Design a protein around this ligand. Structure first.
Ligand SMILES: C=C1/C(=C\C=C2/CCC[C@]3(C)[C@@H](C#CC#C[Si](C)(C)C)CC[C@@H]23)C[C@@H](O)C[C@@H]1O
Ligand SMILES: C=C1/C(=C\C=C2/CCC[C@]3(C)[C@@H](C#CC#C[Si](C)(C)C)CC[C@@H]23)C[C@@H](O)C[C@@H]1O
Lengths: 240, 10, 240, 10
């Protein structure tokens, strides 16, 4: 009926870690290769994703216990989940009014058509945008948003993980926190927890579709040469 | 392998 | 005493190939990651070099006979010589008045200090700038500039080449052309040919120093991650 | 190896 002292600590450090790795001013975006509207948007969006992967690694390293995993498991979890955390964290710039991601300036406003010009089809972009509006309607508390990112990252059902028992226990503790938080602190959220777990399921499907479309891009060197070294390493298929 | 990830993971 | 018909053909196709791969408007530079003046200039300069490597590959493919080499030799020659062709072709933007490369706008004006902020020391930048002013004073004809780039690229004394005999014969024919051109068409150039061959020697020394300093950058992943996939492939040490 | 170079060399 009331959040434990250790549960709120988990929340505090997750919230701080998110504020430390998500810049609401988006001022860093000017450093990316500019947008062009072939695949005219592939250079800017590749820089956007690469920058975001660095943020997700920074967030991950501040989840309680993630750092104490082996370096192999840390990589396994990041390589499988990175695109999912990006889709999740991007909800913070998504707008229902424009059905797009608005990152400050109009040059950093990304329509669906912008993403197609980066090598992606409606097969991915249709369910991605539906995922964003539905996640947006949930009206998540900041505490809930960050817990969902952390739960998604700490999934033991990823290819490559070895310490299944440890990762599951971490993820369990995070779900208990989320469930308690919603119960105590979110009025009218008796159905929210289930809805959020459903969004995790949607992310697996978006991940699958993104992986398929990334694969075709990376098999064409005139496109893959536009990617960054971090993108190719993280979304690549090498195994540690 | 994963040179950059290792670096980023400290 | 007069240029043969086949010698001028070589000149014509080299000149055209250079005009097709060198844009005097520099308008493409706005697509690079912007300059910042750590290694604040490494992203822009890495994009500059990557773009330029593509131009050198385009130039190379139009040298008579280069395309008829094996794909291995074409790569061997490009991997060893690429940085030398870039230093040579950059003379076209170098200015004696500013001791810098001026590519149109002031944001694309590169001082010595700009290059240090990309991870390079005066060990390289001192002889590089001296190389530029001296090559600039030669006042090369366009025909001579392009022949020197082609002779530099077709050197058989590169690590990795296998068809030594073929490449040397190509390079021989190009030197004969250069020697004849200077004799017939360059008044007061009785000493120019030797001077140019000396500049090729200077390029080997700049190449060595650049390779040493590239190596230390590429061993630090926080810097190497800023490079592009084409840079890492061409300046990398993998062997075909 | 040299995937991009091969591509660029046609
Ligand atoms: C990424 C974020 C933001 C927006 C996310 C976006 C908008 C642009 C298109 C993207 C990137 C989609 C895609 C794709 C792709 C690709 Si590619 C060709 C490199 C495999 C996946 C998420 C989409 C902005 C801000 O909220 C920070 C957040 O982190
Ligand atoms: C390149 C060209 C131009 C200028 C050349 C420049 C100026 C910037 C610094 C450079 C690039 C030096 C350096 C270095 C480095 C590095 Si790096 C950290 C990626 C191993 C080598 C040549 C230098 C402009 C135009 O004339 C087209 C021409 O092609």
């Amino acid at each position: 009926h009331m959040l434990s002292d250790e549960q709120m600590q988990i929340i505090n450090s997750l919230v701080e870690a998110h504020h430390k790795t998500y810049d609401d001013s988006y001022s860093d975006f000017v450093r990316f290769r500019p947008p062009v509207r072939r695949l005219s948007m592939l250079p800017h969006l590749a820089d956007l994703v690469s920058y975001s992967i660095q943020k997700v690694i920074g967030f991950a390293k501040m989840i309680p216990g993630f750092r104490d995993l082996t370096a192999e498991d840390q990589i396994a979890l990041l390589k499988s989940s990175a695109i999912e955390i990006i889709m999740l964290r991007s909800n913070q710039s998504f707008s229902l009014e424009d059905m797009s991601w608005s990152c400050g300036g109009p040059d950093f406003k990304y329509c669906i058509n912008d993403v197609t010009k980066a090598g992606h089809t409606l097969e991915l972009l249709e369910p991605l945008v539906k995922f964003q509006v539905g996640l947006k309607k949930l009206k998540l508390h900041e505490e809930e948003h960050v817990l969902l990112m952390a739960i998604c990252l700490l999934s033991p059902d990823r290819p490559g993980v070895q310490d299944h028992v440890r990762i599951e226990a971490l993820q369990d503790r995070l779900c208990d926190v989320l469930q308690a938080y919603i119960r105590i602190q979110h009025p009218g959220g008796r159905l929210l927890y289930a809805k959020m777990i459903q969004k995790l399921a949607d992310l697996r499907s978006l991940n699958e579709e993104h992986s398929k479309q990334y694969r075709s891009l990376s098999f064409q060197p005139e496109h893959s040469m536009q990617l960054t070294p971090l993108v190719l390493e993280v979304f690549g298929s090498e195994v540690s | 392998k994963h040179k950059i990830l290792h670096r980023l993971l400290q």
